[PDB]
Subunit: 111 residues, 2 copies
């Protein structure tokens, strides 16, 4: 394994399989929401899966400064065990984009 | 055909699940609206549990058949239609509200 731990606003490579359906699946990038201490202690995390297919859905947020231009899904929120699923740091995301994700999550469940 | 609405408590099979993530059949709280759930066939729910460890993010659910606790730390976007999520009841407004609060504190 490794000593790596996910932090808020990070970008990780994780496998979301198995999946029932219409739940972003397979290996892919995910933006980490939950803070470093929750991630560390609980060994779990909150994250939004990323995709290279932009269909123009409302909760889609565009991520720049990456290896392949794509979108993160803000309404797709995922609770996972990262230490168990072997999350790996893929990089970082700009504060504004993380902010738009978080902003959309309170819009989805704020109602 | 039934669709999950905000505040609804539903019965759903979370399997398969890996790690410390909640698995098996159990209730859950829909934090997503009716229209979204109806469109995407998806939804955001917090899985409940009968075992309260006194964890910081535990929100006590009162008034159900069993006395459990909903976990706000785990917010899962699942396909309720695909898993055949069934309505078990409703959570009191203040419960859904406390849940929203805790979740949004873990985020925001």
């Amino acid at each position: 394994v490794s000593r790596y731990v996910p932090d808020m606003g990070d970008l990780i490579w994780v496998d979301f399989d198995p999946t029932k359906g219409s739940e972003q699946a397979g290996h892919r990038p995910a933006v980490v929401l939950s803070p470093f201490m929750y991630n560390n202690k609980t060994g779990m995390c909150l994250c939004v899966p990323c995709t290279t297919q932009s269909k123009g859905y409302p909760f889609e947020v565009v991520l720049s400064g990456q290896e392949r231009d794509g979108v993160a899904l803000a309404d797709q929120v995922k609770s996972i065990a990262w230490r168990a699923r072997g999350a790996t740091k893929k990089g970082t995301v700009a504060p504004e984009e993380l902010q738009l994700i978080k902003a959309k999550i309170n819009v989805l469940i704020g109602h």
